[PDB]
Design a binder for this molecule. Structure first.
Ligand SMILES: *[C@@H](C)[C@H]1/C(=C/c2[nH]c(/C=C3N=C(/C=C4\NC(=O)C(CC)=C4C)C(C)=C\3CCC(=O)O)c(CCC(=O)O)c2C)NC(=O)[C@@H]1C
Ligand SMILES: *[C@@H](C)[C@H]1/C(=C/c2[nH]c(/C=C3N=C(/C=C4\NC(=O)C(CC)=C4C)C(C)=C\3CCC(=O)O)c(CCC(=O)O)c2C)NC(=O)[C@@H]1C
Ligand SMILES: *[C@@H](C)[C@H]1/C(=C/c2[nH]c(/C=C3N=C(/C=C4\NC(=O)C(CC)=C4C)C(C)=C\3CCC(=O)O)c(CCC(=O)O)c2C)NC(=O)[C@@H]1C
Ligand SMILES: *[C@H](C)[C@H]1/C(=C/c2[nH]c(/C=C3N=C(/C=C4\NC(=O)C(CC)=C4C)C(C)=C\3CCC(=O)O)c(CCC(=O)O)c2C)NC(=O)[C@@H]1C
Ligand SMILES: *[C@H](C)[C@H]1/C(=C/c2[nH]c(/C=C3N=C(/C=C4\NC(=O)C(CC)=C4C)C(C)=C\3CCC(=O)O)c(CCC(=O)O)c2C)NC(=O)[C@@H]1C
Ligand SMILES: *[C@H](C)[C@H]1/C(=C/c2[nH]c(/C=C3N=C(/C=C4\NC(=O)C(CC)=C4C)C(C)=C\3CCC(=O)O)c(CCC(=O)O)c2C)NC(=O)[C@@H]1C
Ligand SMILES: *[C@H](C)[C@H]1/C(=C/c2[nH]c(/C=C3N=C(/C=C4\NC(=O)C(CC)=C4C)C(C)=C\3CCC(=O)O)c(CCC(=O)O)c2C)NC(=O)[C@@H]1C
Ligand SMILES: *[C@H](C)[C@H]1/C(=C/c2[nH]c(/C=C3N=C(/C=C4\NC(=O)C(CC)=C4C)C(C)=C\3CCC(=O)O)c(CCC(=O)O)c2C)NC(=O)[C@@H]1C
Ligand SMILES: *[C@H](C)[C@H]1/C(=C/c2[nH]c(/C=C3N=C(/C=C4\NC(=O)C(CC)=C4C)C(C)=C\3CCC(=O)O)c(CCC(=O)O)c2C)NC(=O)[C@@H]1C
Lengths: 162, 172, 172, 162, 172, 162
């Protein structure tokens, strides 16, 4: 699962060689950002339930048919809304993992790879999750480079859905 | 493979949980010590041929039958293959030190190796002794106090040691 | 692979015998019903994504732990792999219906599959339950009396069923 | 073993796909001829011993040395003639299977594949079996499309021997 | 692979010893008889298709169920495969005679063959009987006293025989 | 392990065929030289200890630092000299095997393959063994074609070290 560190080892290993000064400098780079990103992941944890509801509410506003039309794939029921907020909690949790890992690896392995197949088979619209992500982006309440990173992960997820 | 950070992530994801504040602080602590980590990788990497050469010398002094005729490191082809294995194991160890996780070493080097050696007739016990000699040479080099900013690398050297010991247990 | 006709031929050749008058009449009878056979293949084939989607929904309603975190269909990659297996098994089943013999399904899909799943940690019991849900969705679609010339497809649906059950037994 | 049905499944499977309307129409085609061909196979069964002797006699006429020259590979003995009529019974039986299966598959898998190697190693002349097939073709006593099919299988066997 | 000379070398090298005077004289003796060796290889090689054809005839006379319908040499494809195996084994045998060592035959032909036949359902016992028939045909041809300078090839024919017997034991 | 005989079998086997008249003539060629080469191997055995010391002495003359400089890789000790004479005994013994086998196979498999790696890792100079081989060449005391062969093997070893 791709992080700056694993990318370097995978390059070195595919060429049968020991790590280079450059791959060592990759690690310094990763370690220079790490602590502010780790902090960002902690604040996302303390606001997760709050963000997830807020996001799911923002989806029900933008797409009112999702609250009213009956059928498995909609939030017209207690169970439908609970599925929806769950899915939003997954995007949020998996995004916090990207802050921990210093790259998109958790996003690729846990969510993005197969996403189209999931959304098609279960009749879930990608645009729904795009709105939820937009809400998360505007309310996480992060600042500094933590925000710029978190937002890169959110943008990367929106782009996979589009 | 996993690195120290994705190792923590994967254990959390399995429980459906965010990484705890404690686990985050444990990783921060590892981030604070990371120059030392990268020195060890650098020093072992840059002295690789010396660590292999000296460990091989010490192994054969201890076990001279390995390279007497009929021994499994006798003949240049088998001696070279033996030195090559020592280098390969040292290389995977440096990868585990850099990532801060054993998975690269387990997945790409140690898994299936015991079985490979028995099918070949290579004495796994003696490979394990060779790995231990590399451990000693490698830690002396990594923990040398000359030409480096002074401080405590005790936990890091224990970690390096545990990767060499994992290699010894996988084949011994 | 064998189809219904070469299956009968191979059993005869093994005994050095001509196909009997009885076996020939049994195949004629199968020829007389062949439009129905081909409807079932057509209907299941053309509703494949619906049969898979609905069977998956019903499996996960029955077995929600499969897709909660730490479950073997949790994460999009594993969910997609699961749906893909369901599709693959349905595709081999349609091939057995068309040829009128299980051999294509056995030889190219089911043989070795139990072993593949245990090496992976995929819960074979739950795959079997997924196949059974596809059976139900598929037979409802194949035996729908709307938009088709009216008649009796009872033996054919039992045959379709037996191919789904073979898939369930091979992994469950 | 190739029949119209198995050819279609093997095309579909090599491309990772479900069967097409066209492959369904292949099946209709196969099923439209099947019953007259099944009938043909039954009449060949009831006349097999008769045809096999008649054929073997026709071979002994055309090639008189086969009845007189001694040695393993000839019909100069009770055992030699019995081997010969056996082989002719195989061509006839395997031809009846082609009528059952709707294609040359049984002929390819049971007789044609390796035939040259068999005939060379055991010093059997292909021309012998060509004559026997010619006799079968002129006495099966079949009519309609059954005859045209049976004769295609007989021609296909003669061609493999030439 | 080893030939007769490197076989002796490898046993010596394992002990760290020079080849003894006795072992050297044993190889000289083999060198003195080498025209006879090369005649046997030539004669078997040049009569290969006759040895295979006649051995196959004798095997099937003895074991007619092998080629009756349902037998494992029935159908032209299986008969051809059987003849091909007989040829392949005869070819490796000629290689062992030429080199004066079994290793080529063991390493490239016999090792794993018993397992191959059981996975296939080929009756190893009957393959062994086929090999024995090739042995008889081959030794009659190799030891024919016509058209050749007269002398004693007794030890050489026993050696040829032992390679055929090794093939029989590996599958029977 | 390559000898004239094994080379021929490996060519025949890689082409799926029986041995040719030419490969038979290869064997005659090998067998025509064999007895004089076998004799050469016997005389090398009776003079091995003598040659090995003589050779090792010649190395200590040419490179006096090897007797005086301390460290693992030198003959400054009882153990260092005993390692050195051992190595020389290996070259001599393995050369005698080439005379037995009729080719370089034993030299390739037991000594030459990996030699550079051995010499580099253990800080042994190739030039040392080149001198030892030169001494062996000038004192084996062989004549005829035996000498020309033995010398080809010695030259082949010197060339691998250079
Ligand atoms: C235990 C392993 C030994 C030790 C380690 C140690 N290192 C430092 C400080 C640094 N280490 C580096 C590493 C590199 N710089 C490079 O250019 C390269 C090649 C790419 C490497 C591997 C760096 C940049 C530093 C900071 C600058 C410096 O040189 O001081 C410390 C100080 C504390 C810290 O973590 O920064 C320590 C303790 N110290 C010992 O005494 C052990 C024997
Ligand atoms: C049981 C499966 C259901 C059923 C079947 C049934 N079908 C027919 C008749 C036909 N079926 C076809 C099939 C196709 N025509 C096509 O163009 C394609 C795509 C290539 C297919 C798959 C055809 C041509 C016929 C004949 C023409 C017609 O449409 O009538 C029957 C009638 C008897 C027969 O065997 O011909 C039956 C009974 N009938 C049911 O009620 C079941 C629910
Ligand atoms: C036992 C196997 C039979 C037998 C063998 C035998 N052969 C010879 C002599 C020779 N054999 C050859 C061989 C060949 N010459 C060729 O041109 C080819 C094709 C490349 C081959 C295989 C040769 C050259 C000789 C010497 C010349 C000659 O023909 O005499 C002997 C004589 C003793 C010896 O070893 O030279 C013997 C005994 N003899 C029998 O009676 C056995 C039935
Ligand atoms: C909320 C924005 C909208 C909504 C959601 C809703 N989702 C589902 C069902 C599923 N969602 C997934 C998604 C994931 N699975 C994963 O493993 C991951 C990565 C960790 C993701 C993102 C899956 C697999 C399902 C189906 C399996 C399951 O039941 O868990 C439903 C139910 C769908 C159904 O057909 O039953 C609903 C209702 N619904 C809305 O209307 C909102 C706009
Ligand atoms: C040296 C300390 C010991 C020793 C070693 C020895 N090893 C071999 C042969 C092989 N070793 C391996 C191991 C690896 N290959 C890999 O790619 C990796 C990384 C994933 C490892 C760890 C393999 C695959 C072989 C066989 C293939 C090959 O040679 O490349 C030999 C040769 C054995 C032989 O009989 O030829 C030897 C001698 N020998 C000792 O005595 C020491 C204890
Ligand atoms: C869904 C109902 C269940 C489930 C499935 C699941 N399967 C896999 C992985 C594999 N499945 C196969 C099976 C096939 N491959 C083929 O080519 C064919 C036709 C011949 C079959 C039947 C294979 C080979 C794999 C592994 C390779 C691959 O992924 O392509 C997974 C992934 C397992 C993992 O840990 O990665 C899953 C999740 N999971 C469930 O829980 C359901 C019961
Ligand atoms: C009759 C036209 C002529 C004739 C025939 C004859 N045939 C044989 C021996 C064999 N024939 C076969 C042929 C087949 N084996 C198969 O499996 C199939 C496909 C189902 C075929 C067509 C084989 C394998 C043999 C040899 C093995 C065996 O004995 O069964 C013989 C005996 C040959 C011998 O050398 O002993 C004879 C006499 N002979 C004539 O003269 C007729 C003109
Ligand atoms: C004839 C005396 C017996 C017999 C033989 C028979 N063999 C096969 C199939 C195979 N035989 C082999 C063996 C080899 N392949 C090699 O490359 C080598 C040299 C290293 C050997 C020794 C293999 C690999 C096969 C399978 C693959 C293939 O067919 O090429 C068959 C066919 C079995 C089947 O069911 O298809 C037969 C019939 N049969 C007898 O009854 C005799 C006792
Ligand atoms: C004598 C010319 C000089 C000399 C020799 C010396 N050699 C060694 C150590 C080794 N030599 C080898 C060589 C071989 N091993 C083989 O298997 C084969 C093929 C059969 C050869 C040629 C090897 C593997 C070693 C190291 C392992 C071992 O100890 O056996 C030493 C000791 C080196 C050390 O670092 O301890 C010495 C001293 N030394 C001189 O100064 C002479 C000029």
């Amino acid at each position: 699962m791709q992080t700056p560190l694993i990318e370097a080892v995978s390059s070195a290993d595919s060429q049968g060689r020991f790590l280079s000064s450059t791959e060592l400098q990759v690690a310094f780079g990763r370690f220079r950002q790490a602590a502010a990103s780790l902090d960002a992941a902690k604040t996302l944890n303390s606001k997760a339930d709050s963000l997830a509801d807020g996001a799911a509410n923002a989806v029900y506003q933008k797409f009112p048919y999702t609250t009213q039309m009956t059928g498995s794939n909609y939030a017209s029921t207690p169970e439908g809304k609970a599925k929806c907020v769950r899915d939003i909690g997954y995007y949020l949790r998996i995004i916090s993992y990207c802050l921990i890992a210093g790259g998109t690896g958790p996003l690729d392995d846990y969510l993005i790879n197969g996403l189209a197949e999931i959304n098609r088979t279960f009749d879930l619209s990608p645009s729904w999750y795009v709105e939820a992500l937009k809400h998360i982006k505007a309310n996480h309440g992060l600042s500094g480079d933590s925000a710029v990173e978190a937002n890169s992960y959110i943008d990367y997820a929106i782009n996979a859905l589009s | 493979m996993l690195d120290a950070f994705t190792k923590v992530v994967s254990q959390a994801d399995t429980r459906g949980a965010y990484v705890s504040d404690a686990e985050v602080d444990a990783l921060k602590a590892m981030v604070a010590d990371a120059n030392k980590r990268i020195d060890a990788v650098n020093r072992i990497t840059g002295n690789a041929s010396t660590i292999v050469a000296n460990a091989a010398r010490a192994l054969f002094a201890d076990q001279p039958q390995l390279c007497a005729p009929g021994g499994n490191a006798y003949t240049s082809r088998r001696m070279a293959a033996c030195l090559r294995d020592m280098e390969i194991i040292l290389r995977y160890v440096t990868y585990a030190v850099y990532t801060g996780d054993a998975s690269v070493l387990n997945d790409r080097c140690l898994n299936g190796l015991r079985e490979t050696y028995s099918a070949l007739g290579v004495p796994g016990g003696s490979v394990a002794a060779g790995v231990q000699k590399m451990k000693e040479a490698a830690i002396e080099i990594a923990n040398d106090p000359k030409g480096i900013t002074q401080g405590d690398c005790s936990n890091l050297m224990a970690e390096i040691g545990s990767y060499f010991d994992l290699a010894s247990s996988a084949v011994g």
